[PDB]
Amino acid sequence: VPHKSSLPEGIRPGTVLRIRGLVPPNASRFHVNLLCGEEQGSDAALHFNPRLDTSEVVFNSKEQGSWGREERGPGVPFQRGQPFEVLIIASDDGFKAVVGDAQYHHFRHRLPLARVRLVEVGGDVQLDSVRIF
Numbered sequence: 750v751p752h753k754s755s756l757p758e759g760i761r762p763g764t765v766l767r768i769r770g771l772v773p774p775n776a777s778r779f780h781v782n783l784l785c786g787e788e789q790g791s792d793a794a795l796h797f798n799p800r801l802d803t804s805e806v807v808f809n810s811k812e813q814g815s816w817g818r819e820e821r822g823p824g825v826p827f828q829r830g831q832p833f834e835v836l837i838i839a840s841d842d843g844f845k846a847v848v849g850d851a852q853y854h855h856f857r858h859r860l861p862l863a864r865v866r867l868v869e870v871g872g873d874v875q876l877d878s879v880r881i882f
């Protein structure tokens with residue numbers, strides 16, 4: 750099961766996305782997206798993309814079909830066959846990514862928070878819960 754849900758209340762500084770899930774034993778990669786529209790080709794304010802196949806975690810945004818400049822977090826705090834907890838925290842200047850007990854990365858806004866409309870979680874991931882606070 751992939752997660753996809755609209756955000757009718759929008760997201761402001763202090764919005765927290767909590768993702769609890771599991772990386773499958775033969776997983777390659779999964780993703781967390783904050784989209785600015787409802788259909789697949791919409792702009793992405795955030796594309797959070799742990800890649801176990803290439804051993805990296807890529808951050809990026811997407812506008813008018815074009816991926817912006819990639820960012821990467823320090824190491825890979827995900828492991829095949831192991832559960833995880835990710836917090837995506839919105840502030841005025843960006844998104845704070847929290848993995849496990851550690852501040853993992855800070856992704857500064859490319860698109861204004863007011864444009865975020867949808868959260869999507871999918872790929873090689875099994876989900877326990879996806880919550881917006």
Ligand SMILES: CC(=O)N[C@@H]1[C@@H](O[C@@H]2O[C@H](CO)[C@H](O)[C@H](O)[C@H]2O)[C@H](O)[C@@H](CO)O[C@H]1O
Pocket residue numbers: 796798807808809816819
């Ligand atoms: C168009 C393309 O293949 N781009 C390459 C990157 O792969 C894409 O990365 C974006 C995020 O930036 C998405 O994760 C998308 O699903 C990927 O296909 C790739 O990460 C980089 C590595 O240097 O090369 C791009 O050319």
